[PDB]
Every structure is written in structure tokens, then in C-alpha cells.
Design a protein around this ligand. Structure first.
Ligand SMILES: *C/C=C1/C(=C/c2[nH]c(/C=C3[NH+]=C(/C=C4\NC(=O)C(C=C)=C4C)C(C)=C\3CCC(=O)O)c(CCC(=O)O)c2C)NC(=O)[C@H]1C
Ligand SMILES: *C/C=C1/C(=C/c2[nH]c(/C=C3[NH+]=C(/C=C4\NC(=O)C(C=C)=C4C)C(C)=C\3CCC(=O)O)c(CCC(=O)O)c2C)NC(=O)[C@H]1C
Ligand SMILES: Nc1nc2c(ncn2[C@@H]2O[C@H](COP(=O)(O)OP(=O)(O)OP(=O)(O)O)[C@@H](O)[C@H]2O)c(=O)[nH]1
Ligand SMILES: Nc1nc2c(ncn2[C@@H]2O[C@H](COP(=O)(O)OP(=O)(O)OP(=O)(O)O)[C@@H](O)[C@H]2O)c(=O)[nH]1
Ligand SMILES: [Cl-]
Ligand SMILES: [Cl-]
Ligand SMILES: [Mg+2]
Ligand SMILES: [Mg+2]
Lengths: 667, 654
């Protein structure tokens, strides 16, 4: 069927070599100055200008300077730019002429001087009423009422195009005979691209009678070129018979349409229908078009304002995000508090926020698993786009949602994880003015799609689509998302200061204490002993060291076990630690041997301390554990150079204790 | 003070009720319920004599009937109209009537008219709309508007006059045909158009003065009215002009003028002012042409402005995109673009104690006085007035935008304004009292404004907020990276401490115990083969006592480095206690285990002395023989090692 629809582009509507009979036309060669073509009814129009003209053939012996007003000839001689029509009227005739390539085209219509202030009053009323429209709907509806009152046509409709060139009636004024066509959808094939390009050449098209026989152009003088002359810039250009039969099927006897332009883009048309033939003069034409231009600018102003108003609204919501942010709320608390507002702001059914492994959801959302399938596919899709968005997910990302999913729209903002905005598919029921009909029709250009027969309402539905994401919403969603990224970063700065604090604290704990025992490791004993020697050498202080070791401990390991032995080491440190004085430092020196540094202690008290420790390890509680004894060497600071000599004395003393029976204390 | 009172007195004159009209028409005032004519302009008789033969003098209108003076269509229209101040236009062959309802009255203006037939107006409408539609920038629109208004109106001088927020004005466009002096970019004072005068444009968008020297015609009473309060004439075109404004135009060198209000919705944005050097009337149709043109051009200009905003937001989005290096690196890299984006001379970014500056800025200390002295943003275009004593005395800065810091600075622009005439304090006696008179000279006089900058457009505030928060994200990312680094090192050091001997660098005893237990479990599940090597340093105490602990520790480190080169990659090497070390050898039978023990024993033997004593180790060896606990293996290997030391040290034993 696609080939039939595409075939419409064969018919050359700019060169039909015929006109509608509500006027007449001449075609003049610029250099030759001769009339080379004239419409078949030229005689009944120019006989007003020249009495001699009775038949068409008389125009062959006629001169243009007898048929055209001096102002029109002067105007054509003067114009440099092409296709800029000149309007010159006389007492009984209204002339419209322009230059095109090597030809001058001149249309003539019957004209009656009508004097009134009607047009000016209507223009003032139209501008005042359009100026008072402040919303989209008001403008288009006021436009339809104004066009109906000005033109008198029984049905006026604003017909907006889709990006695919299909259309919808978005405003309508309908009287007693016509049926209402509001919100009905029409297919692209109704207006081929060639036909749409006409409005850019002449903004108004007029068909005063669908059944009026077209008047062909007859040759009069042999042109130099002979190729058909382009008639696009005028108003008399004959209508394709396909579109006439189209209008008949629509129940329309006469129509007029005006293109709606946004700069150079064709945004829609004002379509007017009547149940009987209906001519409109040049002044009512100019009124209609001037009105439509003003209304159009007004509508673009409303559109460009609602963009700025929406921006202000987004700024307001983002301002609300940071009123909660100072109160130290989490980002998940913020999403739950404001997500209902965002759904209105973004015209979406649901929101999901993912940061790390945690997920916050509001409204209609896929499951956490499906959300993660989405996120991962978003990463592996790898688009560098600041956001990713689709109103038909099943087509853009197949196999991604579950079987039967209702979601169609997704807007995803990547952060450093993701912000997701979900839109349920809206199952819009569309009412078309007639089914699409595969009807072939042969024409002088070839075979093409024929005009449909029925215009009665027919509904169809489109599934798997949502509303499209307007660009203003993409930027708002991204900015909201980044306002969340700022919240999370601060909370994580607090968390990371906490965790780094704990890490450094535990690191300090491990830098100074043996893991199994809990007392000071060997490096810390080495440090304390060296500084104790330095102090004792400067100020002649008195201190001693106790270097003890566990007796036959291998027998404990092999007879009992390593676990029992380790509890014995812990028991021995627990028993020794309560014995010690507050100034003394106690540490694990190597393996099973331990060190005690006793400052401010002379030799008798030092030996006594060794006795308290040795007796302390004996009495400590077994709790079903083997009996254990320690052997203590003892040394005192005797004007030593290095602490190594002191540990040497204590070590020799301790091994001397081992030989005299493993329980004694020796120095 | 003295002149402020004079200017304020201008608002005393009730210009809506002058009880007189300009003489380019005539006016009747009729009571609705009484149906009688109660007021008639003093020249009414030369107009209504067209309708009625009997009317020769003004006094005759008292015995006339309205239904003899007015067209039937105008009477029907007035009877039908409910809305007030909505004029009706009804014309005949010789007269053009404009009448409206106001409270209990009908007001009717009549002007001389003759039917002209042409397509000229329609062609002018088309050409004007096409030319305005082709304007895509602000300047193009206003200049095209000035050319169109001058060509349509024929006035010798046309100018677009834009108002300030304080009601002063400036000429922003001009088209001159004659020997007028140009008034482009000249400033005019508010008193030139009092508020009462500006409010007129909201009732009738066009004001017409066809002759500044035309004698005004007062209204004469005709039938005794019921109310007697002066009737409001604002909706029409015949309302007489204040003689102060007539004298103003004379001093301005203007014989006739026409002005059209320019409306942005309901706000008066400016006027189209037209002047002629000779008297000049314009018919109703040229009036309607001028006004429709001005409204169309106005809508077009508001659309151009709304698109520049939408476009500037696209620009801001582009710069923010380019933003997404340190945050200070980004500020230095991108601040030149931001100065264009924000129309500012300088930027300062403060983060903690560190300050990055670009362009014209105060010093760090003054910036700190600013921060300390300091809503989502705070902004002012007159710093000297809004925050005295804050800057140095001679400081050139006048504009400040502060985003919580991000600082945007605007140098004071010493804008020289050219005014049309010196200020002139002249008193003038008036029916309301004494008020300011129009100045006599309009010649150029200059003044200068210091201590002010451009005002901060709303779009720039929001842009500054968005840029600032995009920078905060950068700094947060950099500092999150730094803190993740510091936490990484802190946690990894914990591994090194919980797993390795500090002095040696190999595994501590806890990790060796764990590995031994898991190796035993593996061997018990899968019937694998592994063994342990437990060695000790010989006569090491002699090293400590003869040499030192520092030498002893370097010997332990040397010995671990020498042993570690011997081991295979699967083997684990750790410090068991003191000088006793352990090797875990998986996938190793007893002979290969003994061989490895020999390689280790020889490794410690030959290693480098470096002026240090020679060292030997004695190694015990054990093999996994279906043991229950690893203690049994360490026990066997320990006994073997003890057998090696007594039978002569530096040996391998199993
Ligand atoms: C294969 C060719 C096809 C075709 C040709 C065709 N159609 C036109 C002109 C028009 N069609 C219009 C369509 C509508 N009128 C409405 O009122 C609505 C909806 C409410 C629609 C969709 C309109 C508006 C025009 C312009 C003329 C007019 O004002 O009616 C042309 C151009 C004819 C001409 O004037 O040169 C052509 C060639 N139409 C098809 O359906 C197929 C068969
Ligand atoms: C104490 C009262 C004062 C006063 C009164 C006054 N002025 C007007 C009318 C107008 N003044 C206008 C000013 C300008 N015309 C220009 O062409 C320019 C420059 C581009 C300026 C500033 C305009 C435009 C009007 C409107 C009438 C007109 O178009 O000429 C009125 C109102 C008069 C009336 O409409 O009845 C009044 C009461 N002017 C002062 O200077 C002081 C003395
Ligand atoms: N369970 C356990 N055993 C350890 C620990 N540190 C060292 N050992 C054991 O200590 C033993 C070496 O201690 P030695 O002093 O040489 O031998 P001993 O049995 O105490 O003999 P004498 O001191 O001469 O009475 C080895 O078998 C090590 O396994 C430890 O933290 N836990
Ligand atoms: N410098 C230093 N010495 C240590 C360290 N750990 C243990 N020691 C020394 O180890 C020595 C005791 O080791 P032993 O095995 O009992 O004595 P030995 O001389 O090696 O005996 P044999 O092995 O039979 O030759 C003490 O002098 C401790 O100071 C350490 O980290 N650094
Ligand atoms: Cl036309
Ligand atoms: Cl008027
Ligand atoms: Mg021991
Ligand atoms: Mg040893």
C-alpha cells in the first residue's frame, strides 16, 4: 500500500495547464511581449476591458496594452524579484500579475467596488480578541471562531501536522449541516508533499466550487519554450481531480485553506468547508491571511513563554530540594519526600533512584531485578549521552522488560548511579475520519492511491508508546538528578570521615599492641627502654628490667595443643599485669619471653618485684590447664651506654636461672 | 524638593475631563435615559448642518433631535452596546462617526470623511507584515517598525521611545525625512509624560494632535444634565490637549504629532512618537493601519526576546556540559567563557582557605570582608549604596553576585548619558494650581552616572546557580577521591600489620597457623602431600652480646631475604617465634623436602656478611602423615630441629 501512497508525487500540480473558472488568465512572454497562452474563458473577462473581444481568437490580434492597466504593466516592467504578485484593480476588474522565468502570468477576476469599514472593524476585533488569548487552547479556538465569522464557511478547523505529516483537528467551529470532526485523525496521504509545498508559495488556497468545470489554457502565439508554465504563485491554478472527488466524499462543496507558519516551517492549516459553493473576494482573502499570521506569532509567543514558565517551576522545585538538604536529610529521604511533585513536573508515572546497591522507588516501577537489568543494559549500551530516553522501550531496547510489561517511557540520568523516570504506556484510542483504504486509481501520470470513500469515525489503538520527553524535561530531570548527587556526596563525606577515623584508630591499636596477648609489642618496648636509658644517663635515675621466659612450654604445646598454650600465655599476661606498678611497662619481647621495665626502682625492690611476678604466675588459676612456671632474669642500669648490654645481663641471668632449676630468679 | 513638588503637581491637571476638544472634529454628549443632548462642542453646527438644514448656529442644537443628527446604524449600535468605552464606527457619504457609552452618557465624535476606493491599505498591511515577519533580531524589528511608521504616516520624524523602570525614557530608533536634528539615544525625563498621560494609552492606543496651534473648542451645555460632573472623554480621539503639552511641542519644534502606545501584555513598554513640521491630519484608516502595525511588531519583538532567553538557556546548558582536573583547574580553564555568559568583568572562587581569581577582582582580604559580611544568591548593581563602607573608598567595583563561595563582579560603568536639554525649573500657573512648565531648550546636555553596573538579568542568576553547583560536584568528586585514597591506605596498612612481622616483612605466626590448618584440611580431604621446614638461628645470642641488637635485626632480615629466594612460589614463609621460622611446602614428598631444607641451610650459610658475623641455621623437617592437628607436625619438626642442633649445628634433620 506504501507504493500506492508514494505514487501521489507523480501528478505535477504546479503545471495543470488549466484554471478554475472563477477567473481568467493570460501568460505573456517577457521579451516577446506577446500573449502566448490564454484561458478558455478569457473573452468574457477582457471584453470588459476591450469591446473588440467577442471570441477567444480575438485575443490573438489583441495587444496587452489594450487589456492591462498602465500601472500593472509598469509594475511588471519594474519588478526585479520573481513571484511577488502585484494587485491592480480598475472599475470592473481585479488584476493579479507576476513575473516567472521568461513569462508574465496575469489573473483577472470580476470586481465590484464595495465601500464599507467592515474589513477594518473585523481586523480591530480580531487583533483585540487574539491579543487577549493567553493559553494555547484559547488562541486556536478563537482563531476558529474568527475565521468562521470572517469567511462565513460552515466548518472551520485548525489542523495540526505530526512529525510524520499525519494530522489532527485541534480546534473546530461547526454549524448545523456539517458533522463535527474535532480530534479526528487524518493520514499523510490526504496532503502530498507537493501539495504542502504550495502553502509556502501562496499561503491561501481557494476552491469556490468542487463541481466547476476547469478552463484549459489555449495557445495563441507560439512560445519559444513550449514547456508548461508554472502557475503556483496564483489563485486560479486548477485542482487535482483526486482532491475534488476527495472533497465530494467529505460532503464539501467549497473549501479554503491557509497555512500556519512558524518562521519557515509549516505547522498546520486552517481548513474551511461549506455545504454549497462560496466565493471569497481578494479583501476577505487578505483579511484571513493577515489574521492567521498575527494569531500564529501570538501562539509562538505563548509557546515560548510556557517554556520559560516551566523553567521557573523547575527552579522552584530544585530550590525546595535544598531546603531539605540543609536539614541533613538523606538523599533517599529527599526522593521519598518530593517524588510525587516530580511526577507532575515530568508527566511521568514513577521514579526510581539508584545509588550503589540501594534503591528508592515511588509510583509505577519495574521490579528491583528489572531495574538492575535496565541499569546494566544502560552501562553496556554505553551511550555517552548525558541522559538516555525513549517513549517506546520495547522497540529501542528489546527483550529488556518482562513478558507483558506496561512500561513504555524511560529517562535515565547517569551519576558518577542512575536516576530513572518511568512512563506507563498510554493506550490512546485514536478516532480517524475513515479507515485507510487500499484503492488504486489510474491518472494521466500513472497509478496512485485513490481518495477514500468513508469519512465516518473509525478507532484504532497504538500500544507500546508513551508521551515523548520534551527537551525542557530532559534538562530538568538531569538538574534534579545532579541536585541529588550533591546530597549523597556530603553524606558520604561524613561516612568516610567516620570510617577513616576508625581505620586510623585501629591502625594505631595494631601498631603498639601484640595481637594475641594485648600487651605492648617488642618495638614499643625497645623504644621505651632506649629513652629510659637516655633519661637515666642525663639525670642519674635508677631503674631495672625483668626478662622472663616460660619453662618447658614446648611440652605444653605438644602434650596439650597450641590453643591451650595460647590461653596459657594470655593467663600469664593477665596474672602479671595485676602485679605491676603503675610506672612499669610490660611487653612481649619475643616468642614466649616477656620484658618488664621498672623505672624508679632499686635492686632490692627489683628482686622483690621479680618474686611477686614469679609467685603470681604459680598461683594463677588453671581452669583445667597444665601448671606453668616462669624463669626471670633481672638487670639494673649500671651506667650503661646502650640498652643492649642491659638485655645481655638480663638474658645471661635468665639462662642462669634456667640451669639452677627453672623457677628461680637470678641477676 | 522645589522642583519635585512642581513635577508632582503635573498630576493635578485632570486631562481626562478637559470639557473641550481639538477642532478637527465635533462632539455631542447625550444622556442615555433622558435621550436629550446635554453637551455639544462649540463648532458642532458646521458639522451637523450636513444632517439637518435647520441647524445654522450652535444654539439650534437645543431644538434638534438626535435621530436627525445621527445615522440609524449608530443609534442602533449605541442602544445595543452593553460594554462601556467600546467605540462604534459608523460612516456616511460625508461624515465619519465614532461613538461610545460611558456610565449614563453616549459620547459621539464626528469628522469630515470622503470615500476613497483603492487597494493601498491592503498592500501596506501585506508589505508591513512581510517586513516585520522577516525581522529575526531586536534591532532589525525596531528599525523596520520606524521605517514602516514613517512611510505609512508621512510624518517628518518617527521615533521609538522606550521607558525605564523609573518612567524615564530613551529614543531607540529614528527615521527622519526633513531637516530635524537627530534625537537618537537621547534621554527624556519622566515629567515629559506624567502618569495620567501614560494611562491614556491603556484607554486609546493612539493619540493625535493634528495642529498644536489649533484653537480648542469648549463644550457648551444644551440641555440641563442630571449629574453635571465633567464627562470622561478618554476613549475618543477629539479630547483636547493640555496647554502645557502643546507648549512642550512648540518648544520641541513640533506642529503636529501622533503617538501609539507599545504594550507588552498590559504594561506600557514604549511609544511610537511621530512629529511633523507643519499641521497634519491622518484619517481613521491610516490610524488603524499604524496601530495594527505597531501591535504586530510588538508581538514579534516579544517573540524575539522569548527566543533569545530560550537560546541563552541552551548556551548555559552547553557551558555546563563542557564543565563535566581539580575544581580550581576547571575555574582557571573555563572562567573566560563564563565572563561572556554572565556579562561580568571578573570571577572569584573560594574553597576553604584557598582562593582562585580571574579578571578584575578585589584583593583576597577585601574578598574575605565580603564573604564575612555576607537567599540562594545575593546581588546588587549599586554596591556603594547597598553596602557602604564595605569596599575601599576609591574602589571601582559596583556590581556583585554572590552564590554560596562563587563571586561574580561587575566594574562600575561610568555611563555618560546625553539628555535633550538642561534641567529647567520653570513654574507655570494652571487651573489646578502651580506646576512645572515645559523647558524651553532641548539642546544636548550631558551628565555622568558613577557607582552603578548593569542589573543582573533573571536568566543570569539561575545560570550562576547552575554553574556554581556544577563546580561543587567537581570539588566533591576530588575530595571523595582523596578520602577513598586515605581510607584505602589505612585499611591496607591494617592488612600489613595483621599479617606480617614488622621487623622481617614475612608472615607473622597467626597467618602461618591459619595456613597450616587449611593445608591440613586440604590434605585430609584430597589426600594431598605437604611438609614443613622449621629452622632456627645458631648461637644468635652470641651475635647480640658481641655485636648488637641492630646487627642482630639486620641478620634476621638478611636471613629472611636469603631464605625467601630459595622458596618456590607455592611455599609460605613466616616467623614462628624469635629466631625460629617456618616454611610450608605444599605438593612435596619427604626427599624433595629434605633437598629444599638443604637449599635453605646453604642459603643462610653463603649469604653476604657485610662486616657482620657469619650465620648458620639448623633446620628440622616434617611431612604430613595423616595427622589430626597441625600441632603434631610442628611437634615432630621441632624435635627434628632439636636433634639437628645437638648433633652439630647447621644441619638438616627429619
Ligand atoms: C495521491 C494523491 C492524493 C491527494 C491529493 C491532493 N490533495 C490536495 C489538497 C488538499 N488536501 C487537504 C486535506 C484535508 N482537508 C481537510 O479538511 C482535512 C482534515 C480535516 C484534510 C486532511 C487540503 C486541506 C488540501 C488543500 C486544498 C484545500 O484547501 O482543500 C491536493 C492539492 C490540490 C490542489 O489544490 O492543488 C492534492 C493533489 N489526496 C489524497 O487523498 C490522495 C488521493
Ligand atoms: C506638568 C505637566 C507636564 C507635561 C504634561 C503632559 N504631556 C503630555 C503628552 C505627551 N508627552 C509626550 C512626550 C514625548 N513626545 C515625544 O515625541 C517624546 C520624545 C520621543 C517625548 C518624551 C508624548 C508622547 C505625549 C503624548 C501626546 C503626544 O503624542 O504628543 C500630556 C498629555 C497630553 C494629552 O494627551 O492630553 C500631558 C498632560 N509635560 C511636561 O513636560 C510637563 C510640563
Ligand atoms: N602457642 C604458642 N606457642 C608459642 C608462642 N610463641 C612461642 N611459642 C612456642 O615457644 C616454643 C619455644 O620456646 P622455648 O623457650 O625455646 O622452649 P621452652 O619449652 O620454654 O623451654 P625452656 O624455656 O628452656 O624451659 C616453641 O615451641 C613455640 O611454638 C605463641 O605465641 N603461642
Ligand atoms: N635482635 C633481635 N633478637 C631477637 C629477636 N627475636 C628474638 N631475638 C633473640 O633471640 C635470642 C634467643 O634465641 P635462642 O634460640 O634461644 O638462642 P640461640 O643462641 O639461638 O640457641 P641455638 O639455636 O641453640 O644456637 C634472644 O637473645 C633474643 O633477643 C628480634 O626480633 N631481634
Ligand atoms: Cl487574491
Ligand atoms: Cl479613530
Ligand atoms: Mg621457654
Ligand atoms: Mg637459636
Amino acid at each position: 500500500i506504501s507504493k500506492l501512497i508514494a505514487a501521489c508525487d507523480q501528478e505535477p500540480i504546479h503545471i495543470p495547464n488549466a484554471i478554475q473558472p472563477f477567473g481568467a488568465m493570460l501568460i505573456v512572454e517577457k521579451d516577446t511581449q506577446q500573449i502566448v497562452y490564454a484561458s478558455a474563458n478569457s473573452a468574457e473577462y477582457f471584453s470588459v476591458a476591450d469591446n473588440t473581444i467577442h471570441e477567444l481568437s480575438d485575443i490573438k490580434q489583441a495587444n496587452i496594452n489594450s487589456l492591462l492597466p498602465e500601472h500593472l504593466i509598469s509594475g511588471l516592467a519594474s519588478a526585479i524579484r520573481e513571484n511577488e504578485p502585484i494587485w491592480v484593480e480598475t472599475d470592473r476588474l481585479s488584476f493579479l500579475g507576476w513575473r516567472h522565468e521568461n513569462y508574465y502570468i496575469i489573473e483577472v477576476e470580476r470586481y465590484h467596488v464595495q465601500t464599507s469599514n467592515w474589513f477594518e472593524i473585523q481586523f480591530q476585533r480580531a487583533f483585540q480578541k487574539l491579543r487577549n488569548c493567553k493559553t494555547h487552547n484559547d488562541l486556536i479556538n478563537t482563531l476558529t471562531r474568527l475565521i468562521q465569522e470572517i469567511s462565513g464557511y460552515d466548518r472551520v478547523m485548525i489542523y495540526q501536522f505530526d512529525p510524520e505529516w499525519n494530522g489532527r483537528v485541534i480546534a473546530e467551529s461547526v454549524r448545523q449541516l456539517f458533522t463535527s470532526m474535532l480530534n479526528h485523525h487524518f493520514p499523510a496521504s490526504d496532503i502530498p508533499a507537493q501539495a504542502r509545498a504550495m502553502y509556502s508559495i501562496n499561503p491561501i488556497r481557494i476552491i469556490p466550487d468542487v463541481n466547476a468545470e476547469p478552463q484549459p489554457l489555449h495557445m495563441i502565439h507560439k512560445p519559444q519554450n513550449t514547456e508548461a508554465v508554472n502557475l503556483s504563485s496564483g489563485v486560479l491554478r486548477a485542482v487535482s481531480p483526486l482532491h475534488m472527488q476527495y472533497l465530494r466524499n467529505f460532503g464539501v462543496s467549497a473549501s479554503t485553506s491557509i497555512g500556519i507558519f512558524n518562521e519557515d516551517e509549516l505547522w498546520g492549516i486552517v481548513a474551511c468547508h461549506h455545504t454549497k459553493p462560496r466565493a471569497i473576494g481578494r479583501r476577505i482573502r487578505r483579511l484571513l491571511v493577515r489574521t492567521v499570521e498575527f494569531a500564529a506569532e501570538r501562539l509562538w509567543l505563548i509557546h515560548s513563554r510556557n517554556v520559560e514558565r516551566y523553567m521557573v517551576t523547575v527552579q522552584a522545585a530544585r530550590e525546595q530540594l535544598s531546603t531539605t538538604a540543609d536539614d541533613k536529610h538523606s538523599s533517599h529521604e529527599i526522593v521519598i519526600e518530593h517524588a510525587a511533585d516530580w511526577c507532575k513536573l515530568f508527566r511521568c508515572d514513577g521514579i526510581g533512584y539508584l545509588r550503589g546497591e540501594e534503591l528508592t522507588t515511588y509510583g509505577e516501577t519495574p521490579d528491583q531485578t528489572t531495574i538492575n537489568k535496565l541499569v546494566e543494559w544502560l552501562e553496556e549500551n554505553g551511550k555517552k549521552s548525558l541522559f538516555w530516553h525513549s517513549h517506546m522501550l520495547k522497540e529501542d531496547a528489546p527483550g529488556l522488560l518482562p513478558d507483558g510489561s506496561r512500561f513504555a517511557g524511560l529517562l535515565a540520568i547517569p551519576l558518577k548511579s542512575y536516576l530513572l523516570l518511568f512512563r506507563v504506556a498510554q493506550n490512546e484510542v485514536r478516532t480517524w475520519a475513515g479507515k485507510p483504504e487500499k484503492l488504486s486509481v489510474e491518472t494521466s501520470t500513472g497509478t496512485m492511491l485513490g481518495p477514500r470513500k468513508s469519512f465516518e469515525a473509525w478507532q484504532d489503538e497504538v500500544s507500546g508508546k508513551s508521551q515523548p520527553w520534551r527537551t525542557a524535561q530532559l534538562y530538568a530531570a538531569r538538574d534534579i538528578a545532579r541536585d541529588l548527587l550533591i546530597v549523597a556526596d556530603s553524606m558520604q563525606l561524613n561516612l568516610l570521615n567516620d570510617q577513616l577515623a576508625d581505620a586510623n584508630e585501629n591502625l594505631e591499636k595494631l601498631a603498639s599492641f601484640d595481637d594475641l596477648t594485648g600487651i605492648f609489642n617488642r618495638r614499643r618496648m625497645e623504644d621505651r627502654l632506649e629513652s629510659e636509658v637516655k633519661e637515666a644517663q642525663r639525670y642519674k635515675k635508677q631503674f631495672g628490667i625483668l626478662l622472663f621466659d616460660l619453662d618447658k612450654f614446648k611440652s605444653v604445646n605438644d602434650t596439650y595443643g597450641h590453643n591451650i598454650g595460647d590461653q596459657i600465655l594470655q593467663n600469664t599476661c593477665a596474672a602479671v599485669s595485676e602485679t605491676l606498678r603503675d610506672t612499669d611497662k610490660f611487653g612481649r619481647w619475643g616468642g614466649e619471653e616477656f620484658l618488664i621495665i621498672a623505672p624508679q626502682t632499686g635492686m632490692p625492690e627489683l628482686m622483690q618485684l621479680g618474686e611477686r611476678v614469679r609467685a603470681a604466675v604459680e598461683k594463677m588459676q588453671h581452669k583445667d590447664l597444665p601448671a606453668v612456671t616462669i624463669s626471670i632474669g633481672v638487670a639494673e642500669f649500671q651506667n650503661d651506654t646502650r640498652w643492649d648490654h642491659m638485655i645481655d645481663r638480663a638474658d645471661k641471668a635468665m639462662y642462669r636461672a634456667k640451669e639452677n632449676g627453672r623457677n628461680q630468679v637470678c641477676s
